[PDB]
From a paper:
Note, the 5/B/6 MBL, which we use in our biochemical and structural studies, is a different isolate from the commonly used BcII MBL (Sequence ID: EEL64219.1). In this paper, we couple kinetic and structural studies of the free and inhibited Bacillus cereus 5/B/6 MBL to understand the structure-activity relationships that underlie the inhibition by the 10-mer DNA.
The 2.5 Ångström (Å) resolution crystal structure of aptamer-free 5/B/6 MBL with both Zn2+ ions bound is shown in Fig 2. Subclass B1 MBLs display a αβ/βα sandwich fold in their tertiary structures with a consensus sequence of HXHXD(X)iH(X)jC(X)kH (in single letter code for amino acids where X = any amino acid, i = 55–74, j = 18–24, and k = 37–41), with H, D, and C residues coordinating the Zn2+ ions. Our structure shows a similar fold. Interestingly, our structure shows that in 5/B/6 MBL Zn2 has a higher B-factor compared to Zn1, indicating that Zn2 exhibits a partial occupancy in the active site pocket unlike Zn1. This result suggests that His263 plays an important role in directing Zn2 to its location within the active site by acting as a gate locking Zn2 in place once it is bound. 200 models of the complex were calculated using our X-ray crystallography model and a hairpin model of the 10-mer aptamer, which was calculated in 3D-NuS.
Numbering used by the authors: 36 to 257
Write the structure that this text describes.
């Protein structure tokens, strides 16, 4: 259990194992602190993030923290849906020549929310390799948003569930303004059906757990 932080504590990275870390940032909204999780992947050919952060201020500092820790550059990011906590650092990414991967739909919705457009290069099942690190993206259907995807790391059996999966502490689904609450259950079932061997599940917000987080989210939807 190893967490690196900036001095304020607004940005932290937590070790799941040597090459996979959770990044978490606090964005403040009407006096209220909200954490958001993504992943940091340490690969032979650079660093890969799953999701950016609330804004460019945080995204830029996040990048510098990880580039210093691992002594190499952030080359790619995978955007799991078009909300601010996921997509708010797009300008930082473009400015630094960091490729922003997404589904066409996510790219479409990003444009329509006024954000810079990610690549729209991902299909519903896409396998990527960065150095020796394998990354699978999967669209399970509508849930938290229309466009939400999950990121699977087959070599670690680690699932970045994003906001499709709630933490164990969550007692409601949170922000459902853009959600499809009647399809969300099916969409989690598609995840459960596809990955029979989940060791860790990282939710969009809150503590890392395991396969249980997906069952908890199903309860929250009943
Ligand atoms: Zn969201
Ligand atoms: Zn979320």
């Amino acid at each position: 259990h190893k967490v690196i932080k900036n001095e304020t504590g607004t940005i932290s990275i937590s070790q799941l194992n040597k090459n996979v870390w959770v990044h978490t940032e606090l964005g403040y909204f009407s006096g209220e602190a909200v954490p958001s999780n993504g992943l940091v992947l340490n690969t032979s050919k650079g660093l890969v993030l799953v999701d950016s952060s609330w804004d460019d201020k945080l995204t830029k500092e996040l990048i510098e923290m990880v580039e210093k820790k691992f002594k190499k550059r952030v080359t790619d990011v995978i955007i799991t849906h078009a909300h601010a906590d996921r997509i708010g650092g797009m300008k930082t990414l473009k400015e630094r020549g960091i490729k922003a991967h997404s589904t066409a739909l996510t790219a479409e919705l990003a444009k329509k929310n006024g954000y810079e457009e990610p690549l729209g290069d991902l299909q519903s099942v896409t396998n990527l390799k960065f150095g020796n690190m394998k990354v699978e993206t999967f669209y399970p259907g509508k849930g938290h948003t229309e466009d939400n995807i999950v990121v699977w790391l087959p070599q670690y059996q680690i699932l970045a569930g994003g906001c499709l999966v709630k933490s164990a502490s969550s007692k409601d689904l949170g922000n459902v303004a853009d959600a499809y609450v009647n399809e969300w259950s099916t969409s989690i079932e598609n995840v459960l059906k596809r990955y029979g061997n989940i060791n860790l599940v990282v939710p969009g917000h809150g503590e890392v757990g395991d396969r249980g987080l997906l069952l908890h989210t199903l309860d929250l939807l009943k």
